[PDB]
Structure 1
Amino acid sequence: RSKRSAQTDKKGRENKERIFDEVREALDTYRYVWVLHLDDVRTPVLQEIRTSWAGSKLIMGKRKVLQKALGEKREEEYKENLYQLSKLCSGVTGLLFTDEDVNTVKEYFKSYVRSDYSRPNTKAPLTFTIPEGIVYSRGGQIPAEEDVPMIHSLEPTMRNKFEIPTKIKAGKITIDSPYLVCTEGEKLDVRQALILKQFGIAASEFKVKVSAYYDNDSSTVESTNIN
């Protein structure tokens, strides 16, 4: 006794094994392989990346499962020196198989960029400041004519979760000072990212970068630091 106390089921080891088998039976039918640690990417951005080349096979799943599928070490390598890819991959398990030119693929990956919310630990693009009056959906960064005042329903979340001196005046969220969330180049915390997500402002830009590349028939790994 005294132990601790929906219609979607769990995938589990069955789906892990299915993904592993799919990777094993599909890797050999391509020319180049790329590993990317897409830590934080919106679903529309991921869909755009996928549709950029419908002929490229996207692969993802558990890091350990993908490492086992590719061969954790030389003893289990699916291809010669392919275990180097698993050894050198440490972030998110983004993976891609392609037949397009390596130079073209890496150039496209480097060029790709999309607006997004500044994630924690990133420098502040600008000195975001909520004005000293009625707050708006866009945080007051645009004129009130083009902005809509924030509704009081989420006022407690601003007051407590985001720790700002918001208050209710005639049902409108307001602050008594030009509340700056961060200064230029300041390191953002989780609170700033949450505030930016609430305001729906794409503070910064994100571009997917390849962590490592692999050539199949040559069976060789390589580094491509396209930041």
Structure 2
Amino acid sequence: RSKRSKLVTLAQTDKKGRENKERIFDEVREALDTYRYVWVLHLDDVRTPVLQEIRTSWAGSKLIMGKRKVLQKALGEKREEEYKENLYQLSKLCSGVTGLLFTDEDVNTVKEYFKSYVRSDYSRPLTFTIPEGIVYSRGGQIPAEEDVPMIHSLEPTMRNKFEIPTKIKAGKITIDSPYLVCTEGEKLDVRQALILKQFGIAASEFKVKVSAYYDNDSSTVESTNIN
């Protein structure tokens, strides 16, 4: 005995299994002879309306995402086994979180789009000092006369997880010394990014980068480097 007691729940959603893997094994091999362009895209951090923007903007494209080794299983990782030919070099490149794209419009439009397409997400850049008074949920962005004081439930979250010293006088939250969370030109810590997350500061821009292209009729591997 003396085993770990696992937490049992009652939620609605259930686990997928292997049968969702083998469908993505089939949908990748089906999309090769159907569409003409194979675009592999490295995109590590994503936001869901960013992804739901790219899906609905392009009807001719099919943006198929999944596990990496399933994509190696379906495209064929070794040169000996592959669905269509000259395909084992481009599947070597997908090392990060990658989702394949199957369009048929142009090779110039796709490579032009993602440099033109840019968004803004969390920083995960500019520095921020907190005033030594009542802290607000915007955090000195907008004028504090219109601001909202922070909810005191996340104040124990601030004293323990964010390491920021907050002692509380009355219904609002107070700090007594001015505190800066980041400095410019520095790689941000994960505790520094979560301060900017609770403050709602997504002031670092986001863009998706693409790494390679394949054409079925030409049957050759094309590598393009844009960030």
- 5+ unaligned residues in a row in structure 1: which ranges? 120-124
Q: Quick one: distance in 1 between partners of 2:112 and 2:63?
A: 18
Runs of 4+ in 1 over 3 A off after TM superposition: none
Once the 2 structures are TM-superposed, how far is the Cα of residue 77 of structure 1 from its aligned partner? 1.7
Q: Quick one: distance in 2 between partners of 1:201 and 1:19?
A: 36
Which residue of 15, 35, 38 maps to 1:33? 38
User: Structure 1-normalised TM-score?
Assistant: 0.93
User: Structure 2-normalised TM-score?
Assistant: 0.93
Once the 2 structures are TM-superposed, how far is the Cα of residue 106 of structure 1 from its aligned partner? 1.1
Q: Is the Cα contact below 8 Å between 2:32 and 2:84 reproduced in 1?
A: no
Once the 2 structures are TM-superposed, how far is the Cα of residue 32 of structure 1 from its aligned partner? 1.1
- Between the two proteins, what is the percent identity of the paired residues? 100
SS of aligned partner of 2:147: coil
Q: Quick one: distance in 1 between partners of 2:145 and 2:113?
A: 39
Corresponding pairs, count: 222
Q: Is the Cα contact below 8 Å between 1:127 and 1:183 reproduced in 2?
A: yes
Q: Is the Cα contact below 8 Å between 1:66 and 1:93 reproduced in 2?
A: no
Q: Is the Cα contact below 8 Å between 1:196 and 1:203 reproduced in 2?
A: no
Q: Quick one: distance in 2 between partners of 1:145 and 1:104?
A: 48
Match of 2:98 in 1: 93
Q: Is the Cα contact below 8 Å between 1:209 and 1:226 reproduced in 2?
A: yes
**Structure with greater helix percent:** 1
1:6-36 deviation line (CA, Å, top 9, x unaligned): 2211112110001111111122211111111
1:122-178 deviation line (CA, Å, top 9, x unaligned): xxx211122211111122222113422111111011111111112222122222222
Q: Is the Cα contact below 8 Å between 1:89 and 1:212 reproduced in 2?
A: no
Match of 1:122 in 2: none
Q: Is the Cα contact below 8 Å between 1:129 and 1:141 reproduced in 2?
A: no
Q: Quick one: distance in 1 between partners of 2:69 and 2:78?
A: 12
1:27-75 deviation line (CA, Å, top 9, x unaligned): 2211111111211111111111212212200111110001110111111
RMSD between aligned alpha carbons?
Answer: 1.3
Match of 1:218 in 2: 218
